[PDB]
Amino acid sequence: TPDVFISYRRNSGSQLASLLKVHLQLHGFSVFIDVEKLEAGKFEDKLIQSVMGARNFVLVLSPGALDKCMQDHDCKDWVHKEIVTALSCGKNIVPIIDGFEWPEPQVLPEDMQAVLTFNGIKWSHEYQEATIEKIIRFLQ
Amino acid sequence: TPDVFISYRRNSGSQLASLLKVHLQLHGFSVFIDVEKLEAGKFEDKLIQSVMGARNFVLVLSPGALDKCMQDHDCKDWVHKEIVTALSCGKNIVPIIDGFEWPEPQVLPEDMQAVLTFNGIKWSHEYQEATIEKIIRFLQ
Ligand SMILES: Cc1c(-c2ccncc2)n[nH]c1NC(=O)CCc1ccc(Cl)cc1
Numbered sequence: 001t002p003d004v005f006i007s008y009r010r011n012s013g014s015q016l017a018s019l020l021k022v023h024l025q026l027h028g029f030s031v032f033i034d035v036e037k038l039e040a041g042k043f044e045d046k047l048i049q050s051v052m053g054a055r056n057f058v059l060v061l062s063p064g065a066l067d068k069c070m071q072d073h074d075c076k077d078w079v080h081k082e083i084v085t086a087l088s089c090g091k092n093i094v095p096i097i098d099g100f101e102w103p104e105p106q107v108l109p110e111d112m113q114a115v116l117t118f119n120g121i122k123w124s125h126e127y128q129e130a131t132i133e134k135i136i137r138f139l140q
Numbered sequence: 141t142p143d144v145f146i147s148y149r150r151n152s153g154s155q156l157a158s159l160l161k162v163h164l165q166l167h168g169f170s171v172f173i174d175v176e177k178l179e180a181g182k183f184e185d186k187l188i189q190s191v192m193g194a195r196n197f198v199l200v201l202s203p204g205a206l207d208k209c210m211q212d213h214d215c216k217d218w219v220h221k222e223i224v225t226a227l228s229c230g231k232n233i234v235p236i237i238d239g240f241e242w243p244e245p246q247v248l249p250e251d252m253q254a255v256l257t258f259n260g261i262k263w264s265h266e267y268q269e270a271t272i273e274k275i276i277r278f279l280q
């Protein structure tokens with residue numbers, strides 16, 4: 001089972017999520033990202049089991065990444081779903097900040113406001129090797 | 141002297157340009173990307189020298205990547221300058237298309253309109269390994 005689940009917003013974080021996958025695999029981690037390891041069957045069940053399976057939950061916060069989570073109180077947004085699973089399983093959540101404006105907790109559904117309590121890592125375009133090293137230090 | 145020069149628009153193509161650098165290096169190419177190899181001195185001269193020295197010119201076309209080239213008739217825009225240098229040296233130009241709308245030639249300065257005559261590679265988020273294999277096929 002993968003050690004790392006990468007959760008990301010497809011319309012804005014696909015490239016950074018892919019770059020994280022390559023680097024983490026190079027440092028010996030088993031990584032789940034949907035486009036490489038989400039395979040056949042009902043995706044809702046597979047996505048949840050994949051979040052549960054990985055010790056680490058790497059959350060890619062590209063600009064606007066949580067916009068579709070706002071007022072999603074029925075929890076139909078898939079990043080929202082992935083965050084709730086990670087929170088309820090007590091995963092090692094590692095937010096990666098890439099030009100993301102932190103929202104005030106009151107704009108998010110109650111069940112994911114806790115994601116704002118985890119220490120995040122700032123993605124540095126100028127110092128990417130060092131960013132990668134700090135992420136690895138955060139992984140369990 | 142590196143084999144591959146990666147030209148990209150910082151505000152929109154940084155992540156893909158970085159991802160291309162990692163993959164190309166893993167396959168044995170020497171890559172120039174500014175954040176790793178632009179060092180001390182007058183950057184204007186070093187950037188032109190680096191384009192002149194690389195057999196391959198990989199052009200990252202993210203959405204809007206050439207907007208700042210338009211009406212840049214004095215050639216002050218750095219992507220515009222890098223493209224003109226690669227064209228004037230007959231480099232192996234390899235455009236990488238990531239959500240980029242092809243402009244009509246007449247909206248671009250005449251000294252770079254020839255960039256549209258080079259066969260490009262469509263970046264596929266779902267088939268990244270195959271995209272990378274295609275890019276390596278295009279490189280010399
Ligand atoms: C406030 C603080 C500190 C800190 C405080 C005082 N003195 C030293 C360090 N360290 N880290 C944080 N807060 C984060 O990193 C949040 C990252 C984040 C952002 C958005 C989402 Cl949606 C989710 C997560």
Ligand SMILES: Cc1c(-c2ccncc2)n[nH]c1NC(=O)CCc1ccc(Cl)cc1
Nearest residue numbers: 201206235242243255256257258259260261
């Ligand atoms: C038209 C064509 C063909 C082709 C033609 C006929 N039948 C089969 C294939 N193959 N390739 C191209 N054209 C490109 O790939 C341009 C890529 C590009 C895009 C934007 C910029 Cl600004 C610069 C470069």
